[PDB]
Amino acid sequence: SSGLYLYGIFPDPIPETVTLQGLDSQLVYSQIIDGFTFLYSEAKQEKYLASRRNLISHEKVLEQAMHAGFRTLLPLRFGLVVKNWETVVTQLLQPYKAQLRELFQKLAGRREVSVKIFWDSKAELQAMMDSHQDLKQEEVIHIGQLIESNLLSRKESIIQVFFDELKPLADEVIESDPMTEDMIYNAAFLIPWENESIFSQQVESIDHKFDERLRIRYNNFTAPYTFAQISHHHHHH
């Protein structure tokens, strides 16, 4: 009654010379089924807690596959344990072949990078009160609407420059909502694999234009989760 912890799905064979280690230090295997390669390890439990430790093990199996050449992949969300290969075939594979082939077409030769921009939220709020209009530092609804809309403008002036100036090196851009209070941009870019060096330098030359006003967090190597999504197919019962 060991199930299968699944890490990702790849279009090509992965050789056994690619040594890999996963959750609980289990060895990681590949398993080809009709031209789809599933990277997996033996699951001891049915469920794994998303502890910091386990999330790192999961993330590194896929990153290590990418470092070894297997850059096109659907990466799976942490925790995916299925009972047996029959269930992998009937539920995960058979109904999804076409979407998985399309998806491998879109990702081939491409990579996800991310850009998170932070500013000093407090400082830029007080700096904005000192601007062109300056009230005294109910109709409380009106005034809290006017600050919130003029704050958005001040963010969006920064954001827009980064978006106009990086978008030309990318095939697709997906923006997500701020995680922290200081975060003003959280964007994933899908770029040709060989655009990374120029992208990296472009990010840096844009930042130089804003002086020490921003913190930039650029991740240049990650499994492509934002751009590898599978919509639901019909399942008969």
Numbering used by the authors: 2 to 138, 151 to 250
What did the authors write?
To further investigate the putative GVs of Anabaena sp. PCC 7120 from the structural point of view, all Gvp proteins, except for GvpA and GvpC, were successfully overexpressed, purified and applied to crystal screening; however, only the crystal structure of GvpF was eventually solved at 2.55 Å resolution in the space group C2221. Anabaena sp. PCC 7120 GvpF is composed of two structurally separated domains, both of which display a fold in α + β class, followed by a C-terminal tail inserted into the middle area of the two domains. Further structural analysis showed that the N-domain of GvpF displays an architecture in which a six-stranded β-sheet (β1-β6) is sandwiched by two α-helices (α1-α2) and the helix η1, whereas the C-domain adopts a modified ferredoxin fold owing to an extension region consisting of three consecutive helices (α4, α5 and the N-terminal segment of α6). Moreover, the additional C-terminal tail provides an interface for the N-domain and C-domain to pack against each other, resulting in the structural stability and correct folding of GvpF. Superposition of the two structures showed a very similar structure, except that GvpF of Anabaena sp. PCC 7120 possesses a shorter helix α5 in the C-domain. Besides, structure-based multiple-sequence alignment revealed that GvpF proteins are highly conserved among diverse species of cyanobacteria. It indicated that Anabaena sp. PCC 7120 GvpF might also function as a structural protein involved in forming GVs as that of M. aeruginosa PCC 7806. Moreover, structural combined with enzymatic investigations suggested that GvpF and GvpN are structurally and enzymatically conserved, respectively.
Gas vesicles (GVs), a unique class of intracellular bubble-like nanostructures, are found in many aquatic and soil microbes including halophilic archaea, photosynthetic bacteria, and heterotrophic bacteria. As previously reported, formation of GVs is related to a conserved cluster of 8 ~ 14 genes (termed gas vesicle protein gene cluster, or gvp gene cluster for short), encoding two major structural proteins and several essential minor components that might putatively function as chaperones, nucleators and regulators. In addition, GvpF is reported to be a structural protein localized at the inner surface of GVs. Here we found that Anabaena sp. PCC 7120 possesses an intact gvp gene cluster, which shares an organization similar to that of previously identified GV-forming cyanobacteria.
